[PDB]
Amino acid sequence: LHVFLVSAPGQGNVTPMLRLAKSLASKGLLVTFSTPESYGKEMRKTNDDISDQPILIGEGSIRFEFLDDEWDELDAYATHLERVGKQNLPRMFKKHEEEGRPISCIINNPFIPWVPEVAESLGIPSALLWVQSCASFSSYYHFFNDLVSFPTESNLKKDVCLPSMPMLKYDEVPLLLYPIVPLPIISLKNAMLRQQKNLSKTFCVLVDTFQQLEDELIHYLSKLCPIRPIGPLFKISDADDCIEWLDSKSPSSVVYISFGSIVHLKQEQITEIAYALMNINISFLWVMKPPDKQHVLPQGFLEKVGEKGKVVKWSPQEQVLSHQSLACFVTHCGWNSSMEALANGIRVVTLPQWGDQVTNAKFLVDVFGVGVRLSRGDLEDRIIPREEIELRLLEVTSGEKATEMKHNALRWKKAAEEAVAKDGSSSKNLQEFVDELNNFR
């Protein structure tokens, strides 16, 4: 069968889709991957084996057919892209009809929510790849459908009681739904809400989580909405100095610090982390991506810290997280990174910034039981002073509850491995998706 996975541009939407693609191909399908060509050429330079002809995976194949951007020159770009996509996609699609390749399904992610309008037009089924938590999905669903009270301009600090979810404070709901947002991400709140509008065009929502993580909610949510938990995707389908340096340390001794490829902190926040690390003489591996302007450390930092500390510009993070030397993971709590902590059994120190990170942070600490809270996200707008950073790091590594949180972390590691086992929840869900596609045939 032929499925067509078009993703909005940008790292955090293209990579989760590719992971899905590689796994649908491994089950024999013919998976075409599309993205805006303006993002495609940059995809061509960084990675090879993508500028070419099909790539073979298992009994399946993956091809790339980048949507013609006609963009050579964000809210201006979102408009342009939608009109050009709605004009180009259908003949791209029929070129496969002419050539004997009738497309059996179209999968998008929520940051091109007009795609299912296309799929309805040309009679091709539409599926949605949701890359955030299921709490995040339920939040948007209950917001768009006005099913539960959320904070408003008139009551900005209101609490939110979603079903089969803990109470969320006003600043714990995903920030795209909070009323006071910058104009840049009004265009992101718009896309989310359009996707909830176009959910009625969509027959299946594939969620990058696993049943046991959000079990009671997925059972509630699935009666209203067609959710299939299929994650974590990074587990399903896949700096020597980093791992070499890590092998030299004792087990459960390195504080790992990484805020993913997008989050740049304020310099003042960087300075308080650095002095905290220095003050408590902990081992640490700190990823400081260079751009924004490039951070600077305290004078003599590298020297004073010594063999305990190591700052890198890039990390093999999936390899780093599985390493036994890690004592904990200071993280921005993006969903993929939160799952990566869970799957690998490592405690978190939550420093959420924007978006769903404030929701993931709450769940990491107060639901999943795998770490401590260091900040509350962008609406706090306070620099987390060194004293508190030192406090949480000792809490997460030697405090009264530190081995309790290690225990929860390992039980979630265990549960994540079962979801993707041959007979696990997520493997089954992805098979039944593939089944429904065949029974469309």
From TrEMBL:
UniProt-listed Enzyme Commission number(s): 2.4.1.-
SUPFAM superfamilies for this protein: UDP-Glycosyltransferase/glycogen phosphorylase (SSF53756)
Keyword terms of this UniProt record: Glycosyltransferase, Transferase
PROSITE patterns given in the database record: UDPGT
MF terms in GO: quercetin 3-O-glucosyltransferase activity; quercetin 7-O-glucosyltransferase activity
UniProt enzyme class: transferase
Binding site for UDP-alpha-D-glucose: Q132, W314, S315, W335, N336, S337, E340, D356, Q357
Signal sequence, renumbered to the chain: none
Family listed: Belongs to the UDP-glycosyltransferase family.
Annotated protein name in UniProt: Glycosyltransferase
Native organism: Nemophila menziesii (Baby blue eyes)
Organismal lineage: Eukaryota, Viridiplantae, Streptophyta, Embryophyta, Tracheophyta
Gene of this entry: NmF4'G7GT
